[PDB]
């Protein structure tokens, strides 16, 4: 069985002119496509994996909420050839913002600064630092995530979906979220 094979890291890896067509190993019967879009109040980016899968055909969609960071995941598995291309005012606080940058850019005090605001009449006054991961086709993809959130006090909080996780920690004060990988409990 032939499937589209591509990986997207908030870039163009799954673009028309980067997509590969792969043939699957004996005993794998499905092609997979998994897109996880993560949304901050200043932007959105997507991880995506297309490749040979396992398991049964099906559709699995899930929306996640981590203190105001929204993630939306669509995971589709078919059984036909090349089928797996069917998806696609300031408040006081300032946060560092990573919304598509690599782990290279998104380090320390390097990322851009964003001005939080009370999106949808909810209060976004904490800063967040963590990462998003999406796993499918025996491949895993992750990027850092940074922005405003509604909680100033989370530590290694997370939400999970099918092959998908969004996790990190929160903090209080403007640009607190310089680097919270070491933050204790």
């Amino acid at each position, epitope marked *: 069985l032939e499937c589209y094979s591509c990986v997207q890291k908030a870039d163009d890896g799954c673009s028309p002119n980067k997509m590969k067509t792969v043939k699957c190993a004996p005993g794998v019967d499905v092609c997979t496509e998994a897109v996880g879009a993560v*949304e901050t*109040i200043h932007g959105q980016f997507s991880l995506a994996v297309r490749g040979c899968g396992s398991g049964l055909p099906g559709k699995n*969609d899930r*929306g996640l*909420d981590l203190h105001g960071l929204l993630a*939306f995941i669509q995971l589709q598995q078919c059984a036909q050839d090349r089928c797996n291309a069917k998806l696609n005012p300031p408040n006081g606080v300032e946060c560092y913002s990573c919304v598509g940058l690599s782990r290279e850019a998104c380090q320390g005090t390097s990322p851009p600064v964003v001005s939080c605001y009370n*999106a*949808s*009449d*909810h209060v976004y006054k904490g800063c967040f630092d963590g990462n998003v991961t999406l796993t499918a086709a025996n491949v895993t993809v992750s990027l850092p995530v940074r922005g405003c959130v509604q909680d100033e006090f989370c530590t290694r909080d997370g939400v999970t979906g099918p092959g998908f996780t969004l996790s990190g920690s929160c903090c209080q004060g403007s640009r607190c979220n310089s680097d919270l990988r070491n933050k204790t409990y």
Partner: antibody
Amino acid sequence: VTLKESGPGILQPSQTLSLTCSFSGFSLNSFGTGVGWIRQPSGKGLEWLAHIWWNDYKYYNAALESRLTISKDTSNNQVFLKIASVDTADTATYYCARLRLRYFDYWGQGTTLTVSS
Amino acid sequence: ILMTQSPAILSVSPGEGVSFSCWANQNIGTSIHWYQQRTNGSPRLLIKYASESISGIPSRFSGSGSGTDFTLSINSVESEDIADYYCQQSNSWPIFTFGSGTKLEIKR
């Protein structure tokens, strides 16, 4: 901020219900905004059916995810719901309401649908 | 997540301090909202996140609770507070669920 539902009023069983929500005083481009559809059979409770978000993501009541498709045209300020294969159980008042992230702050007056032949 | 309202019917005299219960089978934090539907009228958002008041709502409507049990209270019932009251949970966002409703009746 207002929402106005419109619909066909009466349908026979098996037909497709097409509902339009025309809204003003806000935008479906704002992060966290969403528009949902809720119905109430007369004398009975409210049931959430579906909601569509600013970023085009759609959620459905799983008991009706096979019958439901929700969509939007942001340019005209409209959200649509169509429910295929109507039955007598789809006799209800259907409301559109705006989703501020987690709750329905603004609702329309509702459009009443009778399914009968 | 299961949501049970109680009572279903709540017969009350004008001027009393009334309370509506909404119970979750599970812990839902503060993810509960309260709606008023007067007869022949649209649902109207009353209470946000358990206890946050909505602008343009009379001050007699207040809510409370966290975790499993949640309550809506009217400090002084007026004649136009005869209505159905619905809770909705947001604990399983983007999946929303409503209660069965509490119908406020007048005693006589």
